[PDB]
Design a protein around this ligand. Structure first.
Ligand SMILES: Nc1nc2c(ncn2[C@@H]2O[C@H](COP(=O)(O)CP(=O)(O)OP(=O)(O)O)[C@@H](O)[C@H]2O)c(=O)[nH]1
Ligand SMILES: Nc1nc2c(ncn2[C@@H]2O[C@H](COP(=O)(O)CP(=O)(O)OP(=O)(O)O)[C@@H](O)[C@H]2O)c(=O)[nH]1
Ligand SMILES: Nc1nc2c(ncn2[C@@H]2O[C@H](COP(=O)(O)OP(=O)(O)OP(=O)(O)O)[C@@H](O)[C@H]2O)c(=O)[nH]1
Ligand SMILES: Nc1ncnc2c1ncn2[C@@H]1O[C@H](COP(=O)(O)OP(=O)(O)NP(=O)(O)O)[C@@H](O)[C@H]1O
Ligand SMILES: [Mg+2]
Ligand SMILES: [Mg+2]
Ligand SMILES: [Mg+2]
Ligand SMILES: [Mg+2]
Lengths: 330, 428, 426, 426
């Protein structure tokens, strides 16, 4: 139903360890409360739906955060995964990243396959994967960008079924190869080696799991069970100059900020509408939010997973990031 | 010794500058080509015999305004490395002024500022002119002031800003720029001034009897105000108040950057023959809302500080009597913690008026610099207008499309709330 | 700096554009040979914005004529523009779309656009500092709609930071010229709202009422319609070309025109609209200008502002004026008509005053209204679209171009969403 | 010093050469009698390069006409050149090759060449400091191809340190004149690549497009084709004949033209190509020149540069120009079009500016492009060669001259290797 706001802090690295003796900008005091200040207006308190930090394994984060969303997908309606951060805070990392690390993508597939094996006697699992890339207000096939970006019918059925162009859809049969498709997408994904966040996700991405189940039993209704799971990656956000942004570099920053603005506006409107008696959200304002027409604010449950960088070098960024997450709910 | 560097960031500041340097020329006897027929060194520098040129930097991303200067009277005065032009406009957008475009001109600007600073012997400080509405006026001013702090540290920096009127507005996203900019002002300015076009328009209409008010004569009033403020350094009178001295008297607490500059007496060139403009009479006028340069009502707040800069045929004795009179006026409420909150300057240099406007030339004038707590009310109005638009994030995409972060607006707004709270606390 | 590349897509765009360039040339003292015979400095001060000064001091409009029907070129070239417009700017095919958006967009237009963009790029390189593009056309179909749409998309892709400004003739509600106006408009608008930054809604029917009733004219011709449109176009970039007492110019204006990316369809108006006889009973003051400027009857789009709410009104003045005089009228109007403005937008009217009046006038003012009442245009067109589409009437003229009902359905759906957004902001 | 011996091999070479010598004579104020009636010093300063000042101050072109078909001489001599060209320069046989490379090379040409070389040697001795040779001809066959090839080989042997510069008409891809163009071109090119130092690829088809489309002409004649070619030839040695602000001249240029001995086949172009009408919309500035000069559509060879990579572009300018203006355009072009230039060659465009513009122009520029895209010419010709050769079509016309399939096979093989080398450098 309502959007869950979950937040996790990325640990300190040699970029901070060689700085040490420096102060942590994030003071997590319990599972919902963060304190964020060194005094400029005094201790700034935030209350969230679920907090995590550098001591909590991403595997458990998944289990509490998006593992229930995987269940939500098959509760008669679909479900999706959102996130937020200030470029370089963890968004991409938390999907798994390191091969020894279980994360959102890895465990979503692994858990699903275990359920598939057990539930194969109840329903069949015809599943196809879609890889979308969002760059400069253009939607491309993330896995295979060679496909003309014009080829995408961003539209839904009157039944809220996904009715888009012939994207390079792929069936899953394991976790590794599926993640390899995600990686290959990220390989073909537009980045910027010139940025500090080595291989920053300059373009956004949607990993859409199309689940077309069918009833193993024969009955009067004989209706299939279509549902989907989306794992969404973003370009995070940067300063208006972001250190001498030049030409298209600045333009890219603007476009991802526009995308997140529209997304944030739609989230804000949605949470304001979650309480009211209307839901006028201009999803048209961005091809991303158009794609997310039902992902954000349709018949679904979701989560906003915010990645936090406690480094003293990112005080103001995290300051707004936490206030942003709060605003997203409020 | 005592020298000033003026920086005209906004075209409001440029047109004010045009009026100011026009005035300075008349006051020092300097022609449009720099020809003179001394203390002018504070504003002009000799570049060869009979070639005195203005120590000022003009910054525009929109050469049209500069071209008006380059094709105007003082094209023979200002030289090519003062009149700095850019390429793209700031689109009334703090994000573009501070970042997108301004980041590519600030380097040039600073180099020219450094040049003038190297040419100075007793730099007193900088005189920055701008608005809270324009993109360069807002964003670039913010960019520049940050850089000036880096380069010159504690060197005095004045911000002569145009303050968005409570009714007479021109643009729609004025609140956006004003809120972001004022944050920076509080961070970097050493003393800030606010001018309300609406207040002056009514002053012109009433006190000057002007049927059709506009910027031309409005700016002339501003130039009288600024001239009066700087008169104490450029002219040797009785009580010469320095910029540090202004801070000493006008700042009781670091953040108090309001001092409303009220010029009296705003008399039309007609009633002046019937106006018995004594020191006391003029003083009486300057302490009224009738001559206040920002729409407000000081009688609902408290006077933290009040500096009266008298100019021309002014006698200390008569001034003291006038002050004592003011002190007995219950309509003027000073803060309890500053029983001595009065400062007097007296400069023996008759008020100079430039042909081309009304403002009758008088033998006596006073510039009141008033730090009255009531200004928080004006700030509240600005904040409210901001909130109205901000609540719907209206026009926010124009800033975000330049890479502006939402938190920049949120944080600046919070600082503006604190500013008013500071005015609330000193009222106690 | 700040050069503008003008494109004339279609016969409507060519005829309006020709009138526009007549007006601009007249204002800047440039005759039909390209020779400048003015008397000011300001006439050349920003002449670069619109003209290339060719060898011999011949000012050539930075304008490209785009068309699928030869002879259309001659409908302009055979006039004064045979010496004004460059031969390389007459870029056209030899087919014609026949009021078919798809033909002028997917097929016939797609064949032409390669050579158009080549000329566009030439001008892009010729410019010292391109401010943006300006397209004049129509939603009637064919070139203006299809080719205009195509060009916007292609050019926007090339110059994502220099979005094209569009002056487009919209569908009239009574005065119809063809049958498939709903198709061509719906398909074009679907694309336009995604690509354009500012669109001016030009309705011949409303203009007909202005010419006939406001200007007291006999038989309003296309030249009279274009007189009104070109007057608007000149006003829009007067502050660009000329100096005033303040100045938010073109992009500086744009920032204050709309609080949202999509709702950028404006109604244009012109204050000083009156018969020569009735001028003798009128006074040259801004109060008279504003009473005419804010008159819904003088709107150049056939939608009555008062039915919706104003997000903002730009009031661009021309001629020596008092800022107090102007702004007081602005305040009086917003206060008195406050019921028609959006409550939560502090200032609903923007002031811009340039000191250079129109030729033949002592003063003027340009009205650019952002009102949700324009939704009536889109709503009615959508209804007419439905009326035809529901039966697949004339559908085969577009499916022969490779189109499908899905595309049509989406275009309709999108316009409906646009109307809803106006209703929401209302 | 620095004299050039020109040879006109074949009717094509004679007609082009005649046009060339018309142009040069015109530029240097020399009328058809040989009399000089100019007004500068520079017109005579290096007149020795191209002319012998005969008794009576009659400037006689240092040019030799070589031919196998009497009457060809008269096709030039009957014009102004009856008083310009020397009778001893009209060196010809009385047979004709009939578009047969072998006839004009092994047999009929071999009979003539003895008397040609005798005249060549006369001019060699007449020269004070021979800079090199210049041959104009064609790959169509017969004299131009066969006799041209023969002369190059023979003269190269005599003057291994003064390699002949060649302007040769190449085979068109659509506009064919005869059937055995693949044979004659293949056989000639096989030899040319081994003997010549610089070859200009002149394609009538590309020139036809220039004349018709770029120059907006009706019916492009051979004289119009030659106008373009002779314009190039004049440009190539303008810096030789005239002074500038710097100067790398002819051989100094050549050193910077190619990084390899074999890949010396260049595409020529001319900047100022426009109709008299369209000139009125153009500006006299190097930015306009470079936009036209770097336009692939104005190439005089039918290969689109952009399909390959540039080893280098020579940009030779004529007229008073700013070095900053020129070089900034050069830099802007290489940067913007960097994707079409070879990565590992720092400077891919060479600047040379002579201060003496063409007669009738205020300024101009000559394009000489070393691009691998020219491989398309050689590839397509080889394919056409294969098409015929594989069947031994027309083969007997050459085996009757003592040729064999081995020679043909080798000529084809060699051209294929040449194409491969372009692909490698691409
Ligand atoms: N306001 C104006 N409307 C015009 C003018 N000329 C035509 N139109 C209107 O535009 C429509 C006709 O449009 P066009 O000739 O531009 C169609 P286009 O040439 O673009 O494509 P084709 O179908 O290939 O002719 C129709 O509604 C006319 O009534 C004009 O000068 N002003
Ligand atoms: N660019 C030009 N091409 C020409 C010209 N004259 C001829 N040609 C082309 O050259 C070919 C004809 O060549 P030639 O008359 O020179 C053959 P040549 O006399 O050398 O030997 P024969 O076979 O003995 O005639 C053909 O492709 C013509 O279309 C010209 O003036 N310019
Ligand atoms: N008092 C006064 N106000 C002015 C004058 N000119 C402009 N303004 C005000 O200044 C604000 C507009 O800012 P500008 O200074 O024109 O803009 P800018 O600083 O040039 O910034 P950009 O043009 O956006 O780069 C509005 O509030 C105007 O009313 C003037 O001569 N006097
Ligand atoms: N919890 C973590 N533990 C260890 N390393 C981390 C963690 N979070 C992030 N990183 C590292 O920081 C670099 C990642 O930035 P991520 O890739 O986390 O940035 P991002 O949020 O996807 N940036 P952006 O794409 O611009 O929005 C990666 O190489 C990670 O290994
Ligand atoms: Mg990432
Ligand atoms: Mg400005
Ligand atoms: Mg037409
Ligand atoms: Mg012959």
């Amino acid at each position: 139903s309502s959007i869950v706001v979950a937040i996790r802090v990325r640990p300190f690295t040699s970029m901070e360890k060689t700085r040490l003796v420096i102060r942590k900008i994030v003071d997590c005091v319990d599972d919902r409360m963060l304190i964020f200040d060194p005094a400029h207006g005094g201790e700034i308190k935030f209350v969230f739906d679920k907090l995590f930090d550098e001591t909590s394994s991403q595997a458990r984060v998944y289990k509490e955060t998006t593992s229930p969303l995987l269940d939500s997908v098959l509760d008669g309606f679909n479900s999706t995964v959102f996130a937020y951060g200030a470029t370089g805070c963890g968004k991409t990392y938390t999907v798994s990243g390191t091969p020894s690390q279980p994360g959102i993508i890895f465990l979503a597939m692994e858990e699903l396959f275990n359920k598939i094996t057990d539930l194969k006697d109840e329903k069949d699992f015809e599943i196809s994967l879609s890889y979308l890339e969002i760059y400069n207000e253009r939607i491309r096939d993330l896995l295979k960008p060679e496909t003309p970006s014009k080829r995408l019918v961003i539209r839904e059925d009157t039944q809220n079924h996904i009715k888009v162009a012939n994207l390079s859809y792929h069936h899953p049969n394991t976790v590794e190869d599926v993640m390899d498709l995600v990686v290959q997408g990220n390989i073909n994904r537009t980045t910027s080696p010139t940025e500090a966040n080595e291989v920053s996700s300059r373009s956004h991405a949607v990993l859409q799991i199309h689940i077309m189940q069918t009833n193993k039993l024969v009955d009067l209704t004989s209706q299939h069970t279509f549902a989907t799971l989306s794992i969404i990656d973003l370009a995070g956000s940067e300063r208006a100059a972001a250190t001498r942004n030049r030409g298209i570099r600045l333009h890219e920053g603007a476009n991802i900020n526009r995308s997140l603005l529209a997304l944030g506006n739609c989230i804000n409107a949605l949470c304001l509408n979650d309480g009211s008696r209307s839901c006028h959200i201009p999803y048209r304002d961005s091809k991303l939010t158009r794609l997310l027409k039902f992902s954000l604010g349709g018949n679904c449950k979701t989560v906003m997973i915010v990645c936090i960088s406690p480094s003293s070098s990112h005080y103001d960024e995290t300051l707004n990031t936490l206030k942003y997450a709060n605003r997203a709910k409020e | 010794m005592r020298e000033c560097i003026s920086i005209h960031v906004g075209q409001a500041g440029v047109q004010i500058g045009n009026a100011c340097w026009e005035l300075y020329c008349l006051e020092h006897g300097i022609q449009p080509d720099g020809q003179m027929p001394d203390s002018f060194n504070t504003f002009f520098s000799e570049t060869g015999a009979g070639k005195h040129v203005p120590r000022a930097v003009f910054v525009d991303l929109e050469p049209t305004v500069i071209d008006e200067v380059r094709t105007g009277t003082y094209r023979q005065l200002f030289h090519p490395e003062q009149l700095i032009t850019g390429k793209e406009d700031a689109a009334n957008n703090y994000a573009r002024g501070h970042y997108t475009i301004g980041k590519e001109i600030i380097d040039l600007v600073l180099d020219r500022i450094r040049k003038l600073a190297d040419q100075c012997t007793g730099l007193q400080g900088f005189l920055v002119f701008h608005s809270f509405g324009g993109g360069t006026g807002s964003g670039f001013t913010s960019l520049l002031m940050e850089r000036l702090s880096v380069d010159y540290g504690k060197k005095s920096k004045l911000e002569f800003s145009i303050y968005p009127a409570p009714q007479v507005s021109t643009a729609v996203v004025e609140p956006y720029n004003s809120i972001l900019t004022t944050h920076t002002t509080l961070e970097h300015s050493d003393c800030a001034f606010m001018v309300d076009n609406e207040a002056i328009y009514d002053i012109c209409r009433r006190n000057l009897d002007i049927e059709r008010p506009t910027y031309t004569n409005l700016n002339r009033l501003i130039s009288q105000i600024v001239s009066s403020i700087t008169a104490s350094l450029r002219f040797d009178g009785a009580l010469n108040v320095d910029l540090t001295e202004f801070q000493t008297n006008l700042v009781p607490y670091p953040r108090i950057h309001f001092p409303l500059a009220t010029y009296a007496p705003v008399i039309s060139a007609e009633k002046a023959y019937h106006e018995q403009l004594s020191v006391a009479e003029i003083t009486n006028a300057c302490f009224e809302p009738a001559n206040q340069m920002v729409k407000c009502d000081p009688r609902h707040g408290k006077y933290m500080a009040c500096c009266l800069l008298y100019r021309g045929d002014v006698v200390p004795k008569d001034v003291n009597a006038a002050i004592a009179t003011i002190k007995t006026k219950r309509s003027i409420q000073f803060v309890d913690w500053c029983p001595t909150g009065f400062k007097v300057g007296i400069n023996y240099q008759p008020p100079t008026v430039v042909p081309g406007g009304d403002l009758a030339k008088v033998q006596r004038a006073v510039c009141m610099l008033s730090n009255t707590t009531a200004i928080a009310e004006a700030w509240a109005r600005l904040d409210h207008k901001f909130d109205l638009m901000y609540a719907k994030r209206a026009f926010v995409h124009w800033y975000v499309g330049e890479g502006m972060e939402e938190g920049e607006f949120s944080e600046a707004r919070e600082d503006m709330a604190a500013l008013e709270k500071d005015y609330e606390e000193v009222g106690v | 700096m700040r050069e503008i590349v003008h494109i004339q897509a279609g016969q409507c765009g060519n005829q309006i554009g020709a009138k526009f360039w007549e007006v601009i040339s007249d204002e800047h003292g440039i005759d039909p040979t390209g020779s400048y015979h003015g008397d000011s400095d300001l006439q050349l001060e920003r002449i670069n914005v619109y003209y290339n000064e060719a060898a011999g001091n011949k000012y050539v409009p930075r304008a490209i004529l785009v068309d699928l029907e030869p002879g259309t070129m001659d409908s302009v070239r055979s006039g004064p523009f045979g010496q004004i417009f460059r031969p390389d700017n007459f870029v056209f095919g030899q087919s014609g779309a026949g009021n078919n958006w798809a033909k002028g967009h997917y097929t016939e237009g797609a064949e032409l656009v390669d050579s158009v963009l080549d000329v566009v790029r030439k001008e892009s390189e010729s410019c010292d500092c391109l401010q943006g593009f300006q397209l004049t056309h129509s939603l009637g179909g064919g070139t203006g709609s299809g080719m205009g749409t195509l060009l916007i998309s292609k050019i926007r892709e090339e110059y994502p930071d220099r979005i094209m400004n569009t002056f487009s003739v919209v569908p009239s509600p009574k005065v119809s010229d063809t049958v498939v106006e709903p198709y061509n408009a719906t398909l074009s608008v679907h694309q336009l709202v995604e690509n354009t930054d500012e669109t001016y809604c030009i309705d011949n029917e409303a203009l007909y009422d202005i010419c006939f009733r406001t200007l007291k004219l006999t038989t309003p011709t296309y030249g009279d319609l274009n007189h009104l449109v070109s007057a608007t176009m000149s006003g829009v970039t007067t502050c660009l070309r000329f100096p005033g007492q303040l100045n938010a110019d073109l992009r500086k204006l744009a920032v204050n025109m709309v609080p949202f990316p999509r709702l950028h369809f404006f109604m244009p108006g012109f204050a000083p609209l009156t018969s020569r006889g009735s001028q003798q009973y009128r006074a040259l003051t801004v109060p008279e200008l504003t009473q005419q400027m804010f008159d819904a009857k003088n709107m150049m789009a056939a939608c009555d502002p008062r039915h919706g709410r104003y997000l903002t009104v730009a009031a661009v003045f021309r001629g020596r004026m008092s800022m107090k005089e102007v702004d007081e009228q602005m305040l009086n109007v917003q206060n008195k008509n406050s019921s028609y403005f959006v409550e939560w937008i502090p200032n609903n009217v923007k002031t811009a005053v340039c000191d250079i009046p129109p030729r033949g006038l002592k003063m003027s003012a340009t009205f650019i209204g952002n009102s949700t009442a324009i939704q009536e245009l889109f709503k009615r067109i959508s209804e007419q679209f439905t009326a035809m589409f529901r039966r697949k009437a004339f559908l085969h003229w577009y499916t022969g171009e490779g189109m499908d009902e899905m595309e049509f359905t989406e275009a309709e759906s999108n316009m409906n969403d646009l109307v809803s957004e106006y209703q929401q902001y209302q």
